Amino acid sequence: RECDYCGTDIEPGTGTMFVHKDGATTHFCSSKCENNADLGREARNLEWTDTAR
Amino acid sequence: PQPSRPRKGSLGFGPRKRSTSETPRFNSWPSDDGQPGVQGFAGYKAGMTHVVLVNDEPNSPREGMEETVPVTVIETPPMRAVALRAYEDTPYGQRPLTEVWTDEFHSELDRTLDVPEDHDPDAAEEQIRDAHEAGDLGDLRLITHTVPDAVPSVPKKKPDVMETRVGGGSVSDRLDHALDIVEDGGEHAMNDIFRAGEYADVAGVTKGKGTQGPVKRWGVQKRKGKHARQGWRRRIGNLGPWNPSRVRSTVPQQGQTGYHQRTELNKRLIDIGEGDEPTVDGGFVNYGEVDGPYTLVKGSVPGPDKRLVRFRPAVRPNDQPRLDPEVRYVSNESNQG
Amino acid sequence: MEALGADVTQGLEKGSLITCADNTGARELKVISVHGYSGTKNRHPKAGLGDKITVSVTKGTPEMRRQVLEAVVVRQRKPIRRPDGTRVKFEDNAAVIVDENEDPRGTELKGPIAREVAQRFGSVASAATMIV
RNA sequence: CGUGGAAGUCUGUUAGAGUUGGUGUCCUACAAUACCCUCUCGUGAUCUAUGUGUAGGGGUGAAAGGCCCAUCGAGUCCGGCA
RNA sequence: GCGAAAGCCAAGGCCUGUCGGGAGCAACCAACGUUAGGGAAUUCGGCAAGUUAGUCCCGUACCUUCGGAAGAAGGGAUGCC
RNA sequence: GGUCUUAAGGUAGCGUAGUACCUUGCCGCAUCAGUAGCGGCUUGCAUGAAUGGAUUAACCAGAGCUUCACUGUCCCAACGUUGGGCCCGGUGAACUGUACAUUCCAGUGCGGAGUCUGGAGACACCCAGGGGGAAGCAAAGACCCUAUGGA
RNA sequence: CGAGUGGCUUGCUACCUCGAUGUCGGUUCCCUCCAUCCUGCCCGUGCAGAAGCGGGCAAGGGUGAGGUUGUUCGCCUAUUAAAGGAGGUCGUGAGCUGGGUUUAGACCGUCGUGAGACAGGUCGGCUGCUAUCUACUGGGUGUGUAGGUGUCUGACAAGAACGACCGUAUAGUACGAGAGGAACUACGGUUGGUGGCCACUGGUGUACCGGUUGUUCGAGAGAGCACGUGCCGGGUAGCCACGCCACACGGGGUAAGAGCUGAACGCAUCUAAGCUCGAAACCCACUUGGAAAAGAGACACCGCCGAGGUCCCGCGUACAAGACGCGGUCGAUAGACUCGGGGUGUGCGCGUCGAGGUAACGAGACGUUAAGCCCACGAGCACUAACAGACCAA
Ligand SMILES: [Cl-]
Ligand SMILES: [Cl-]
Ligand SMILES: [K+]
Ligand SMILES: [Mg+2]
Ligand SMILES: [Mg+2]
Ligand SMILES: [Mg+2]
Ligand SMILES: [Mg+2]
Ligand SMILES: [Mg+2]
Ligand SMILES: [Mg+2]
Ligand SMILES: [Mg+2]
Ligand SMILES: [Mg+2]
Ligand SMILES: [Mg+2]
Ligand SMILES: [Mg+2]
Ligand SMILES: [Mg+2]
Ligand SMILES: [Mg+2]
Ligand SMILES: [Mg+2]
Ligand SMILES: [Mg+2]
Ligand SMILES: [Mg+2]
Ligand SMILES: [Mg+2]
Ligand SMILES: [Mg+2]
Ligand SMILES: [Mg+2]
Ligand SMILES: [Mg+2]
Ligand SMILES: [Mg+2]
Ligand SMILES: [Mg+2]
Ligand code: NA
Ligand code: NA
Ligand code: NA
Ligand code: NA
Ligand code: NA
Ligand code: NA
Ligand code: NA
Ligand code: NA
Ligand code: NA
Ligand code: NA
Ligand code: NA
Ligand code: NA
Ligand code: NA
Ligand code: NA
Ligand code: NA
Ligand code: NA
Ligand code: NA
Ligand SMILES: [Sr+2]
Ligand SMILES: [Sr+2]
Ligand SMILES: [Sr+2]
Ligand SMILES: [Sr+2]
Ligand SMILES: [Sr+2]
Ligand SMILES: [Sr+2]
Ligand SMILES: [Sr+2]
Ligand SMILES: [Sr+2]
Ligand SMILES: [Sr+2]
Ligand SMILES: [Sr+2]
Ligand SMILES: [Sr+2]
Ligand SMILES: [Sr+2]
Ligand SMILES: [Sr+2]
Ligand SMILES: [Sr+2]
Ligand SMILES: [Sr+2]
Ligand SMILES: [Sr+2]
Ligand SMILES: [Sr+2]
Ligand SMILES: [Sr+2]
Ligand SMILES: [Sr+2]
Ligand SMILES: [Sr+2]
Ligand SMILES: [Sr+2]
Ligand SMILES: [Sr+2]
Ligand SMILES: [Sr+2]
Ligand SMILES: [Sr+2]
Ligand SMILES: [Sr+2]
Ligand SMILES: [Sr+2]
Ligand SMILES: [Sr+2]
Ligand SMILES: [Sr+2]
Ligand SMILES: [Sr+2]
Ligand SMILES: [Sr+2]
Ligand SMILES: [Sr+2]
Ligand SMILES: [Sr+2]
Ligand SMILES: [Sr+2]
Ligand SMILES: [Sr+2]
Structure with missing residues (x-):
């Protein structure tokens, strides 16, 4: 699996899956990604993120 | 009439003092059934990782499916x-x-x-x-x-x-x-005595914590509400009734907590191998790199990294052995991060 | 009860205010008790995803309001662990009112549901639009 | 609509005065009434310095038997007194 | 900055609110910071803590001795160049 | 009862009251559940008109209750920060002390014993701890009675 | 109606305490009792079943959360296997709380000529002490057993280390007209308790990195202060719980009870002798401690001029002093360096762009730059420091 935020491979037996109100599902590889996501930041705009680069 | 409640902590692991030997000493051994053999072995605790396994339990609805299991790595030369x-x-x-x-x-x-x-x-x-x-x-x-x-x-x-x-x-x-x-x-070697899938009893001398209060050591409550601000925060109510006019050894008090011998029962041996298959990236924190004869014990094992642990064929297993579990994956991800 | 197939950290307590995920007319529910639960001295009786709980209707239509009914916890903010180690959490804490036979009181369920809850409460599941 | 700028008027750790809660800290104290935070008043029946008057069954008292030099339901000192 | 406010800094003063050395410095205590989910379930009692907050715009109920209530409540804005 | 004591015999109002014994009075509101709170009723043990009654905008570090918001008050505790605590140099008190004293379980005794009796246990010394006992330390009991006491 | 047991209520008494044994309720922490609420095993039934009702053995474990009230008591709600009662100076203020009783202030009602009273109500109204002894929790030093190293033994000691519930199959089965509706056994999970551990999730993380407000160092760069981080964002190691792992079966002997054989009493009889069974309870099993067990223990090897130990030195798997463990050049013990593995999030400077502005100037954007800065971990590496060397000892 791939982190729906940063884009790196989620180490098996790790991570969290956030279930949005509408039923949407977001697989996070870490707290860092969830936290940056909660700050309303979009992965594309963060250089360290595999998505952006 | 003031509710009932089990006492704080167990009276079965006392006195809660520093251990005499850092090397555990089994006070009981397995039975004489099969062929002649050594009833135990030993190694040094390295650290932990998780492994992905195939459900061996024939009674589980998840039999055959992948399962993530925590594992302690122990170097067993x-x-x-x-x-x-x-x-x-x-x-x-x-x-x-x-x-x-x-x-x-x-x-x-x-x-x-x-x-x-x-x-x-x-x-x-x-x-x-x-x-x-x-x-x-x-x-x-x-x-x-x-x-x-x-x-x-x-x-x-x-x-x-x-x-x-x-x-x-x-x-x-x-x-x-x-x-x-x-x-x-x-x-x-570990091979001579154990086979992956068998249940072992692991004994070890716990992580030392020096002196600690009743709250940590015995799991007693902290003073609550208003009582927590008066000058007492983590001290028990009283040392006992007026009579008997003495403090009973059963009341939770301060002292040595940790560095005691413990014998954890029914620990499944996930895998016995040799090499660097289980070593974590960047090295096991506060230990090092594993590249040799090792054992993967399901779950936790008493003691800090580098401590000598002992193995013994389970004296009171609850389940039947499910030999050589299928290991689909062993995590090598760094324990830093 | 039948195993859930997931480890749950109860995220609710007696007196907690949750969402009533259905069209029964009840909007907000208040947890009163947890079926088959027995605590310990000083502990607040806890409830989490997959539990059947007694409930009080706090907000909603006059008819539904103030009634003492039974419900099933369908979603919770606190994470739960799946067999593969992954954690799962929801946007809110929600429950669906239920009858004596564990059949949903209303006709339609709102929002997603946990697959574990669905498996335990079949008729509730076979009413879910989304099962995560 | 503007002007005007009243008030035992409001906000306010301005100065200054006071002292609600923490029943916190202290309780052989820093202190025989202290410390901290919180809190009340802050143009008025306001606060304050100095000077001055009222003296003990007497003063003084927006009255609590409050206060009259750590002393008050009758100050203190010595005497009556062993 | 509204300011004899905070915070920071001069001039001037001081290191004398006058015993030191050492231990990642344990338990415990005084002050205090942060705690997931829940949210007063605590307790005689929200005690303690916290929440709110400056300024401008919009807008504002019962009641009323017509003065008031009232900053009612509620909503929006706020930097730099 | 359909007057009598002793002059009159409770009017407006308010009322289970900071006044109501019975009492958690009864009905309603609110809550899952409310000896609380509010409204209504109210025969008021023993309300009531400057011994002022009722009522009331504004004001309040005054008493009680409800809601929204908030939160380590709680579930249930964790980690951290600063000063102590601990070890070393220096300085250096006090409280307290009939004697003896390693106690524990029972008993006995002026009926609430480390010291008596019977047993049990107990090698000595030292460090840290939280305070179970010494009916712990601190005060010739404020309570109560007594005194041909005081004010 | 009669006989008792208890010492939880109340009353009585006035032995003890007035040169003081701190109140009620609550809380917290520990032990106990059984007249048992649940759980185990049983008997009876107006026992078909299911659900009950009554009784016996039995104290291992459990007996919880909330609304009014200071309340104890009690009333009420929803859960529950059940939400038992009681003793310990009505256990517990040199532990807490201080709501009530019961000081000094005040109000109301009643009573009193009045001061003032009330076994009426109401608002307010203080919680001292540095532990000598003893007691216990943990930690050391000595002596005894009478040179050392290593491994053991087990007198004794502690434990609840485990208690309970739900679900599936059995089964829509036995039973029953139907309604309704079990069990043995085998499984899965939950709850409470217990011990441990941190890969995972979560918290902390005044290590670290970044953003940014005010002010000061002329600007820039880079910094200080704003309480012991100015504030905001992220957060490593470790420590942790809200996270994860583990916590029988079986034997033996019994109680109540069910029986066998069996006599006194030719019969009968579970009992008198004898025997087979049979409780969550007892003992063993399992975990923890334990040569100071005065019968003061066993084994093996090394050594008595030398085995071994302490000091010293570098450090922690240890730690309040002390203790404990490891390494010490025949070495990777600690540090430096370099890698690796991690945190943050793209450095200074320069170039281009940039709303405008004649220009000066210019917030900011892009590039250089997965940059810069930083690390409580690991590896490599004898470069530095584990040197020199002392002492005790049959
Ligand atoms: Cl407490
Ligand atoms: Cl409940
Ligand atoms: K007395
Ligand atoms: Mg890690
Ligand atoms: Mg990670
Ligand atoms: Mg409680
Ligand atoms: Mg004057
Ligand atoms: Mg929180
Ligand atoms: Mg309560
Ligand atoms: Mg407050
Ligand atoms: Mg009323
Ligand atoms: Mg009149
Ligand atoms: Mg006297
Ligand atoms: Mg008197
Ligand atoms: Mg007189
Ligand atoms: Mg006493
Ligand atoms: Mg009995
Ligand atoms: Mg018992
Ligand atoms: Mg008592
Ligand atoms: Mg006491
Ligand atoms: Mg006291
Ligand atoms: Mg004290
Ligand atoms: Mg009161
Ligand atoms: Mg009072
Ligand atoms: Na105190
Ligand atoms: Na005018
Ligand atoms: Na004050
Ligand atoms: Na006089
Ligand atoms: Na009158
Ligand atoms: Na005033
Ligand atoms: Na806190
Ligand atoms: Na004591
Ligand atoms: Na009797
Ligand atoms: Na009490
Ligand atoms: Na029992
Ligand atoms: Na109650
Ligand atoms: Na007493
Ligand atoms: Na006492
Ligand atoms: Na006290
Ligand atoms: Na008390
Ligand atoms: Na048996
Ligand atoms: Sr052994
Ligand atoms: Sr043993
Ligand atoms: Sr206090
Ligand atoms: Sr005694
Ligand atoms: Sr004024
Ligand atoms: Sr007070
Ligand atoms: Sr102080
Ligand atoms: Sr004082
Ligand atoms: Sr405070
Ligand atoms: Sr003011
Ligand atoms: Sr005289
Ligand atoms: Sr200067
Ligand atoms: Sr000096
Ligand atoms: Sr933080
Ligand atoms: Sr409350
Ligand atoms: Sr409450
Ligand atoms: Sr606003
Ligand atoms: Sr009338
Ligand atoms: Sr004796
Ligand atoms: Sr002490
Ligand atoms: Sr009995
Ligand atoms: Sr029973
Ligand atoms: Sr009582
Ligand atoms: Sr009562
Ligand atoms: Sr008690
Ligand atoms: Sr009081
Ligand atoms: Sr009075
Ligand atoms: Sr009274
Ligand atoms: Sr009363
Ligand atoms: Sr069944
Ligand atoms: Sr049927
Ligand atoms: Sr600072
Ligand atoms: Sr028998
Ligand atoms: Sr010996």
């Missing part, structure tokens, strides 16, 4: 059964009769023992067989030691000596089985 001690049945319990030693000694065993220079193996052996004829021979155990030198991550070179019982068939056959093991050089 070969040991040396340097001697064979025999016990005799006396009216005051079992007592050490004699011992049969060897010629080949590990280069650095003298860091602990006063290695034998002049010993008579034959005479001792005879005495043991004579006691067996007399029907007074108690049990048979081997004096064993580890080779910390084989483990890079472990600083000590001074071997850890521990007696391990030999059970199995008839006393005559396991006597011989023991003698043979000792003869060669006493060299044996």
Whole structure:
């Protein structure tokens, strides 16, 4: 699996899956990604993120 | 009428004092059923990772599906059964009769023992067989030691000596089985005793925490609400009633917490191997890199990294062995991050 | 009860205010008790995803309001662990009112549901639009 | 609509005065009434320095038997007194 | 900055609110910071803590001695160049 | 009862009251559940008109209750920060002390014993701890009675 | 109606305490009792079943959360296997709380000529002490047993280390007209308790990195202060719980009870002798401690001029002093360096762009730059420091 935020491979037996109100599902590889996501930041705009680069 | 409540902590692991030996000492051994064999082994705790497994349990709805399981990595290099001690049945319990030693000694065993220079193996052996004829021979155990030198991550070179019982068939056959093991050089391995999938009892001396209060040590409550601001936060209500006019040893008090011997029952051996398959990226924190004979114990194991742990075939298993579990994946992700 | 197939950290307590995920007319529910639960001294009786709980209707239509009914916890903010180690959490804490036979009181369920809850409460599941 | 700028008027750790809660800290104290935070008043029946008057069954008292030099339901000192 | 406010800094003063050395410095205590999910379930009692907050715009109920209530409540805005 | 004591015999109002014994009075509101709170009723043990009654905008570090918001008050505790605590140099008190004193379980005794009796246990010394006992330390009991006491 | 047991209520008494044994309720922490609420095993039934009712053995474990009230008591709600009662100075203020009783202030009602009273109500109204002894929790030093190293033994000691519930199959089965509706056994999970551990999730993380407000160092760069981080964002190691792992079966002997054989008493009789069974309870099993067990223990090897130990030195798997463990050149013990593995999130400077502005100037954007900065971990590496060397000892 791939982190729906940063884009790196989620180490098996790790991570969290956030279930949005509408039923949407977001697989996070870490707290860092969830936290940056909660700050309303979009992965594309963060250089360290595999998505952006 | 003031609600009931179980007491704080167990009275079964006392006194809660510092352990005499950092090397655990099993106070019980498995039964004599199968073929003659050594009833235990030992290693050094490395750290933890998780593994992905295939459900072995035939009674689980998830049988056959992938399952993530936590695992403690323990470096289990070969040991040396340097001697064979025999016990005799006396009216005051079992007592050490004699011992049969060897010629080949590990280069650095003298860091602990006063290695034998002049010993008579034959005479001792005879005495043991004579006691067996007399029907007074108690049990048979081997004096064993580890080779910390084989483990890079472990600083000590001074071997850890521990007696391990030999059970199995008839006393005559396991006597011989023991003698043979000792003869060669006493060299044996985790393979010789255990098979992945079996349940083991792991004993070890817990992580030391020095002195700690009743709250941490016994799990008593903290003062609540208004009581928590008056000058008392983590002190119990009282040391006991007016009468009896003395403090009972059963009341939770401050003291040494940690560094005690513990024997964790029914620990599944997920896998026994050799190499660097389980080592974590960047090295196990506060330990090092594993590249050799190891064991993967399901779950936690008492003690800090680098500590000597002991294995023993489960004396009271609840389940039937489900041999050689299928390991689909072993995590190597860094334990830093 | 039948295993859930997931480890749950109860995220609710007696007196907690949750969402009533259905069209029964009840909007907000208040946890009163947890079926088959027995605590310990000083502990607040806890409830989490997959539990059947007694409930009080706090907000909603006059008819539904103030009634003492039974419900099933369908979603919770606190994470739960799946057999593969992954954690799962929801946007809110929600429950669906239920009858004596564990059949949903209303006709339609709002928002997603946990697959574990669905498996335990079949008729509730076979009413879910989304099952995560 | 503007002007005007009233008030035992409001906000306010301005200065200054006071003292609600913490029943916190202290309780052989820093202190025989202290410390901290919190809190009340802050143009008025306001606060304050100095000077001055009222003296013991007497003063003084927006009254609590409050206060009259750590002393008050009758100050203190010595005497009556052993 | 509204300011004899905070915070920071001069001039001037001081290191004398006058015993030191050492231990990642344990328990415990005084002050205090942060705690997931829940949210007063605590307790005689929200005690303690916290929440709110400056300024401008919009907007504002019952009641009323018509002065008031009232900053009612509620909503929006706020930097730099 | 359909007057009598002793002059009159409770009017407006308010009322289970900071006044109501019975009492958690009864009905309603609110809550899952409310000896609380509010409204209504109210025969008021023993309300009531400057011994002022009722009522009331504004004001309040005054008493009680409800809601929204908030939160380590709680579930249930964790980690951390600063000063102590601990060890070393220096300085250097006090409280308290009939004697003896390693106690524990029972008993006995002026009926609430480390010291008596019977047993049990107990090698000595030292460090840290939280305070179970010494009916712990601190005060010739404020309560109560007594005194041909005081004010 | 009669006979008792208890010492939880109340009353009585006035032995003890007035040179003081701190109140009620609550709380917290510990032990106990059984007249048993649940759980185990049983008997009876107006025992078909299911659900009950009554009784016996039995104290291992459990007996919880909330609304009014200071309340104890009690009333009420929803859960529950059940939400038992009681003793310990009505256990527990040199532990807490201080709501009530019961000081000094005040109000109301009643009573009193009045001061003032009330076994009426109401608002307010203080919680001292540095532990000598003893007691216990943990930690050391000595002596005894009479050279050392290592391994053991087990007198004794502690434990609840485990208690309970739900679900599936059995089964829509036995039973029953139907309604309704079990069990043995085998499984899965939950709850409470217990011990441990940190890969995972979560918290902390005044290590670290970044953003940014005010002010000061002329600007820039880079910094200080704003309480012991100015504030905001992220957060490593470790420590942790809200996270994860583990915590039987079986034997033996009994109680109530069910029986066998069996006599006194030719019969009968579970009992008198004998025997087979049979409780969550007892003992063993399992975990923890334990040579100071005065019968003061056993084994093996090394050594008595030398085995071994302490000091010293570098450090922690240890730690309040002390203790404990490891390494000490025949070495990777600690530090430096370099890698690796991690945190943050793209450095200074320069170039281009940039709303405008004649220009000066210019917030900011892009590039250089997965940059810069930083790390309580690991590896490599004898470069530095584990040197020199002292002492005790049969
Ligand atoms: Cl408390
Ligand atoms: Cl409940
Ligand atoms: K007395
Ligand atoms: Mg990690
Ligand atoms: Mg991660
Ligand atoms: Mg409680
Ligand atoms: Mg004057
Ligand atoms: Mg929180
Ligand atoms: Mg309560
Ligand atoms: Mg407050
Ligand atoms: Mg009323
Ligand atoms: Mg009149
Ligand atoms: Mg007296
Ligand atoms: Mg008097
Ligand atoms: Mg007089
Ligand atoms: Mg006393
Ligand atoms: Mg009985
Ligand atoms: Mg018991
Ligand atoms: Mg008492
Ligand atoms: Mg006491
Ligand atoms: Mg006291
Ligand atoms: Mg004290
Ligand atoms: Mg009161
Ligand atoms: Mg009062
Ligand atoms: Na205090
Ligand atoms: Na005018
Ligand atoms: Na004050
Ligand atoms: Na006078
Ligand atoms: Na009157
Ligand atoms: Na005033
Ligand atoms: Na806190
Ligand atoms: Na004491
Ligand atoms: Na009696
Ligand atoms: Na009490
Ligand atoms: Na019991
Ligand atoms: Na109650
Ligand atoms: Na007492
Ligand atoms: Na007492
Ligand atoms: Na007190
Ligand atoms: Na008390
Ligand atoms: Na048995
Ligand atoms: Sr052993
Ligand atoms: Sr043992
Ligand atoms: Sr206090
Ligand atoms: Sr006593
Ligand atoms: Sr004013
Ligand atoms: Sr007060
Ligand atoms: Sr102080
Ligand atoms: Sr004081
Ligand atoms: Sr405070
Ligand atoms: Sr003011
Ligand atoms: Sr005189
Ligand atoms: Sr200056
Ligand atoms: Sr000086
Ligand atoms: Sr933070
Ligand atoms: Sr409350
Ligand atoms: Sr409450
Ligand atoms: Sr606003
Ligand atoms: Sr009338
Ligand atoms: Sr004696
Ligand atoms: Sr102390
Ligand atoms: Sr009995
Ligand atoms: Sr029963
Ligand atoms: Sr009582
Ligand atoms: Sr009552
Ligand atoms: Sr009690
Ligand atoms: Sr009081
Ligand atoms: Sr008074
Ligand atoms: Sr009274
Ligand atoms: Sr009363
Ligand atoms: Sr069934
Ligand atoms: Sr049916
Ligand atoms: Sr600072
Ligand atoms: Sr019998
Ligand atoms: Sr000995």
